[PDB]
């Protein structure tokens, strides 16, 4: 049943008695469900220290990964360029998944094509798919550039992307100097961040490699900024803002902030903004290149240092107070531009916010996960706030990264109870938040299932999620926010302190039980 003035969606409709009895009849008659007392027993075993030991002995089974595959990254890299079609040579199912994955995070159109390699291509190569694929794409969607990457199918059968693209230009399927940069992006090597790096390095080689003798380092007086896999509109926007505040000439290489936020005004814009091909060709003339997320931009670093002959600064991700300072100061001495009063003030307002909030932040324990640079910048900023980053998880982290983060933990008294875990996943982390319960978790939406697992043990054991990362699918418009700079540090500080105060109000909202501490002023 249904009352037409108060219509019930799935929740709370299946809580009505005739539904509740119906599901009870289904379970009992046909499911051969385990006894509830046994389900409880096994649940309580999943929370133990004994289970956690067996959980970290896993060698073959990954459960609830906190990473994606290489071509996802290559698409986001590609969307950052002017009137560019991301194109992933291989299987079409992949492209439907990368588009959906990003559609749900940004709540926007994500344009990307496939050349639809079937079984026939497996035995005879995807060569004709590259030829037809690029021709149809060029004509149907009118792109000034097409950036090709690959899915596992195309990688396992070893399609030479380079040859396939050169033969489609020769046979006249696409114009001979129609831009088709490529990258082999195998899903089984690394992760999505590796695919962003590979794609960028491929586009940089396409506009640069065969034209270097013409280039002089520093002649355009600009600094190139390579963003990395970035899924916050506010991070692209804040880097630009601050550089413009300083009056620093820059070139953001791969900039998707316009395509990923077009206006609803009666028309769909497949393409919008992005880094021009002219900025990519003139990029060797920059004074230098800054890598905003260096731990997943290693291939790019070797190409900009090796072919462009730039002396890439040893800068961490500009997250938190110290690393945003270090960033602005490097930018100040490369460009010779002084840091304006506005950024010196914004730094001071951030430090003011830190001093106003430290009593609630101090000693707070966090479990957190994400991509390598995001995780170390979040760890640094938590140490600056006087918080303890107890469980640091980075599934796609490497050994050198782990050593760089254990080193920054070692230098702080707030990193004494902290451990960095690389190659481990969210089922691993589900155990660490049970056996060494933190106060909160900072992570993506996949963390909501860890939070309901901790509430099932009980309220005292519940560890709330604070959504900062990728993907955030269960909340609206948080892709618009900022995690970098002073701006970004102000937003994270306000989220961390207010999540804490929210949980205190929740724990003290009980009449004559706990509300003696339900303070008006905090």
């Amino acid at each position: 049943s249904q009352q037409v003035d108060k219509i019930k969606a799935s929740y709370p409709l299946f809580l009505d008695q005739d539904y509740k009895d119906m599901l009870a009849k289904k379970r009992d008659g046909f499911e051969e469900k385990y006894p509830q007392d046994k389900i409880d027993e096994v649940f309580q075993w999943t929370t133990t220290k004994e289970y956690q030991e067996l959980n970290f002995q896993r060698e073959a089974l990954t459960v609830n990964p906190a990473k994606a595959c290489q071509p996802l990254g290559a698409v986001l890299c590609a969307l950052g360029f002017e009137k560019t079609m991301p194109y992933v040579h291989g299987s079409q199912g992949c492209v439907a998944y990368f588009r959906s994955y990003f559609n749900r995070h940004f709540r926007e159109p994500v344009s990307c094509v496939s050349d639809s390699m079937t079984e026939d291509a497996a035995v005879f190569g995807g060569q004709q798919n590259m030829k037809d694929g690029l021709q149809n794409c060029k004509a149907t969607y009118k792109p000034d550039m097409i950036a090709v990457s690959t899915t596992c199918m195309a990688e396992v059968i070893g399609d030479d992307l380079n040859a396939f693209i050169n033969n489609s230009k020769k046979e006249g399927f696409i114009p001979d100097e129609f831009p088709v940069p490529f990258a082999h992006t195998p899903s089984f090597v690394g992760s999505h961040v590796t695919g962003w790096d590979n794609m960028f390095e491929g586009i940089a080689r396409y506009f640069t490699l065969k034209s270097m003798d013409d280039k002089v380092v520093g002649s355009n007086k600009k600094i190139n900024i390579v963003p990395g896999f970035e899924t916050y509109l506010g991070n692209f926007r804040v880097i630009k803002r601050m550089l413009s505040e300083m009056g620093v000439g820059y070139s953001l290489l791969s900039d998707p902030e316009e395509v990923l936020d077009t206006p609803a005004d009666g028309q769909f814009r497949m393409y919008a903004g992005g880094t021009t091909q002219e900025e990519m060709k003139d990029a060797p003339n920059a004074l230098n290149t800054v890598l905003l997320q260096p731990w997943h931009l290693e291939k790019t670093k070797k190409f900009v240092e090796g072919t462009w002959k730039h002396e890439v600064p040893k800068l961490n991700i500009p997250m938190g107070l110290d690393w945003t300072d270090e960033f602005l100061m490097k930018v100040s001495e490369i460009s010779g531009q002084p840091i304006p009063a506005s950024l010196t003030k914004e730094r001071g307002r951030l430090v003011d916010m830190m001093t106003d909030s430290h009593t609630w932040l101090h000693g707070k324990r966090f479990a957190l996960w994400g991509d390598p640079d995001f995780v170390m910048g979040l760890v640094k900023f938590l140490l600056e706030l006087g918080c303890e980053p107890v469980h640091i998880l980075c599934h796609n982290g490497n050994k050198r990264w782990k050593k760089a983060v254990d080193a920054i933990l070692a230098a702080s008294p707030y990193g004494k109870n902290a451990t960095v875990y690389i190659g481990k996943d969210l089922w691993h982390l589900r155990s660490l938040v049970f056996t060494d319960k933190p106060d909160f978790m900072i992570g993506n939406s996949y963390g909501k299932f860890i939070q309901r697992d901790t509430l099932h043990k009980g309220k005292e054991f519940e560890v709330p999620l604070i959504r900062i990362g990728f993907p955030i699918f269960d909340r609206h418009h948080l892709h618009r926010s900022t995690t970098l700079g002073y701006e970004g540090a102000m937003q994270i500080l306000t989220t961390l302190v207010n999540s804490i105060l929210e949980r205190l109000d929740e724990e003290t909202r009980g009449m004559q039980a706990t509300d003696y501490n339900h303070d008006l002023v905090r």
């Binding site: 009849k25 385990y34 990954t62 439907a96 959906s100 396992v156 609803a264 769909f268």
Partner: protein
């Protein structure tokens, strides 16, 4: 106007190269068309792969089994909890639908083969999730290409542990769409699960045993169907895939009738259970009053008079309820034109429900459907309305531009495109996180959802007052 439509198709197709133009002309019709082959390269097909058809729609929803996306990390991630195939359980303990179990292939596994890694993965699954009642291993592309034999691993390990381990060779390169993956998944249930209780005679059946076949309980859809069928006196032994257990699948050979909702994904095994076990099967439609009523009457006609009486009593109970829904919402939606695009059942099936709210469906089309689906569509759609098979991104944008519909009902990769164009949009896959849309009190939810989006205040606001 049939010539406006005829001329439209032709105009859109001029932007193509030649073999694209010829092939897409075959896949666009005014209500005669060819269907289910390949997609044309570089044209932004909305279609998924055979893996999505197997793991995403048939296997994934089976509750008390662990499904292993065997391959790299991508597929399992993108498909983790993307489809809302609802279930009752304790996830991670006895139920596992929203978790991602994967073999996460690295280069050593590609080079050497992933079968020893799979064998150890099965043991790990058994020590950490003891209460699973079975395991599937869903092959992603690499598995078939590198020549792994996951069947060997499934038999040796399945025997060793006395557990059902189903190998599914649903590699995304296989087939042309999600469709083949559905087929591969049906045959995987036939060969490794359905026949398990052919010897067993201890299930106490009744003359009214039935099974819902091909309802994946999107937003509770199957629960809203089942309640109606059981109020009518029938007993639902099984629910296929949506909130389904392995023992219900194993028990489905004991029913008297199989009720096929989704024909494209479940006709294969329905034909097989009528061959091997003699169980008759029928297609029904639980979208909107008209269709739920004719369906309830037709299912009841297969049994005796006590089920036909209970049928008419059930129709009588819900008649005040759906009449209030049309009384409220049909004035608000009358004469509004709907353009649709889903996968293999819904393009045809929801039309009834739109018509019960006085809406005209002026265009519909399928991603991965066959010709027997397009023969079923013909009858449901009106004259000179547009049909489109495996529509390209370009095409759907160009048809809407011209036709100017009041509502578009498609998937997530289409949603934000049309909202930017000022066209109201409802997802007809995920139901836009709403639903159930099946039965009588899913019609209530359907109707208020089309209304809230079509007559929403934001639509009048897309142009700045200084642009006029």
């Amino acid at each position: 106007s049939r010539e406006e439509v005829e001329s439209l198709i032709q105009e859109v197709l001029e932007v193509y190269p030649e073999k694209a133009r010829k092939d897409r002309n075959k896949h666009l019709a005014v209500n005669c068309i060819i269907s289910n082959k390949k997609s044309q390269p570089g044209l932004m097909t909305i279609r998924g792969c055979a893996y999505a058809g197997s793991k995403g729609v048939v296997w994934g929803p089976i509750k008390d089994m662990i499904h292993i996306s065997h391959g790299p990390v991508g597929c399992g991630q993108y498909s983790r909890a993307g489809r809302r195939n609802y279930y009752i359980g304790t996830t991670g303990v006895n139920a596992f639908v929203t978790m991602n179990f994967t073999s996460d292939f690295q280069e050593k596994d590609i080079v050497f083969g992933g079968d020893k890694k799979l064998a150890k993965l099965i043991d790990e699954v058994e020590t950490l999730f003891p209460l699973n009642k079975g395991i599937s291993v869903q092959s992603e592309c690499p598995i078939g290409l590198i020549g792994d034999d996951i069947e060997s691993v499934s038999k040796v390990k399945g025997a060793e542990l006395s557990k059902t381990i189903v190998p599914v060779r649903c590699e995304g390169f296989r087939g042309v769409s999600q469709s083949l993956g559905q087929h591969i998944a049906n045959d995987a249930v036939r060969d490794w699960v359905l026949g398990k209780r052919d010897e067993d005679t201890t299930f106490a059946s009744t003359p009214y045993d039935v099974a819902i076949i091909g309802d994946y309980n999107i937003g509770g859809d199957a629960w809203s169907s089942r309640i109606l069928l059981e109020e009518m006196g029938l007993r639902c032994v099984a629910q296929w895939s949506g909130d389904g257990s392995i023992s219900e699948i194993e028990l489905t050979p004991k029913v008297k009738l199989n009720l096929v909702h989704c024909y494209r994904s479940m006709n294969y095994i329905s034909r097989h259970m009528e061959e091997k076990y003699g169980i008759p099967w029928m297609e029904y439609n639980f979208f909107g009053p008209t269709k739920t009523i004719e369906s309830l009457r037709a299912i009841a006609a297969k049994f005796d008079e006590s089920i036909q009486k209970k049928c008419e009593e059930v129709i009588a109970k819900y008649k005040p309820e759906w009449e209030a829904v049309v009384a409220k919402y049909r004035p608000r939606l009358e004469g509004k034109r709907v353009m649709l695009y889903i996968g293999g059942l819904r393009p045809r099936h929801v039309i009834g429900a739109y018509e019960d709210l006085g809406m005209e469906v002026v265009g519909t089309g399928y991603e991965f459907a066959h010709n027997d689906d397009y023969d079923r569509t013909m009858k449901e759609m009106g004259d000179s309305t547009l049909l489109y098979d495996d529509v390209t991104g370009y095409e759907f944008e160009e048809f809407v531009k011209r036709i100017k519909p009041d509502l578009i009902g498609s998937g997530i990769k289409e949603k934000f495109i049309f909202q930017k164009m000022g066209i109201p949009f409802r997802e007809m896959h995920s139901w836009d996180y709403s639903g159930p849309y099946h039965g009588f009190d899913g019609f209530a939810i359907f109707a208020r959802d089309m209304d809230m989006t079509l007559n929403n205040p934001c639509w009048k606001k897309l142009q700045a007052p200084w642009e006029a």
